Amino acid sequence: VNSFSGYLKLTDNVYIKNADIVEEAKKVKPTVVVNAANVYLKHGGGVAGALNKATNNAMQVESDDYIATNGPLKVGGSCVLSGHNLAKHCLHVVGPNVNKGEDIQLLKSAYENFNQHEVLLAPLLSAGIFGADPIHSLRVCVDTVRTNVYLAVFDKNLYDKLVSSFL
Ligand SMILES: O=C(c1n[nH]c2ncc(Br)cc12)N1CCCN(C2CC2)S1(=O)=O
């Protein structure tokens, strides 16, 4: 039993809800919140900009130190950093950004990072400003993640479409 509330169950291990991931994280304080990161951990917009803003820029400060030490992530890769006031940990995961020409096949590799964590609150990888089809992202999620994932979809119109079209 966990504290996530109001989710629709899609599969044995994947759950979905129309919710703002920032407000969901603040309420649940999950062990792991997933950020829709880029390789530079520059949290300017989309999910990342919103999560960072909610930490009062502490996520960005921590991220800049991480990059100064380690260099950029790989597309499809991840790192574990603090969750600040939102979660115990933040798993920064880099899905391919279609608006940069990156290979959509890397989306499966990106979701594989979720399997290192028993339970996660997460957005759909590569959706929103990363330019991929969210229906496809949900399909890859369900077919790749084996751990328990609670997906927050900000747009109510998109949420209804994802549910109604889910196979
Ligand atoms: O939640 C957001 C989101 N995008 N910009 C934001 N700004 C502030 C806050 Br708070 C949340 C967001 N989505 C990111 C894109 C992928 N998803 C869409 C496809 C269904 S999403 O995972 O629903």
Q: Answer whether residue 152 is part of any domain.
A: yes
Torsion 75-80-81-86 (CA) sign: positive
Closest ligand 1 atom to the C-alpha of 128? 15
Q: Answer whether residue 1 is part of any domain.
A: no
Q: Answer whether residue 141 is part of any domain.
A: yes
d(CA 102, CA 162): 23
Query: In terms of residue numbers, what domain contains 79?
Result: 8-163
* Number of helices and strands in the chain (H, E): 6, 7
Q: Answer whether residue 3 is part of any domain.
A: no
Ligand 1 center to residue 146 CA distance, Å?
22
Work out how many domains the chain is built from and give that number.
Answer: 1
Q: Answer whether residue 62 is part of any domain.
A: yes
Residue nearest to atom 5 of ligand 1 (CA): 46
d(CA 43, CA 62): 11
d(CA 124, CA 13): 15
Tell me the CA distances in angstroms from 37 to 8, 20, 21, 33, 163, one per residue in order: 26, 17, 14, 12, 25
> For residues 124 and 138, is the Cβ–Cβ distance under 8 A?
yes
Ligand 1 center to residue 4 CA distance, Å?
18
Ligand 1 center to residue 126 CA distance, Å?
10
Ligand 1 center to residue 46 CA distance, Å?
6
Method: X-ray
- Give me the CATH number covering residue 76: 3.40.220.10
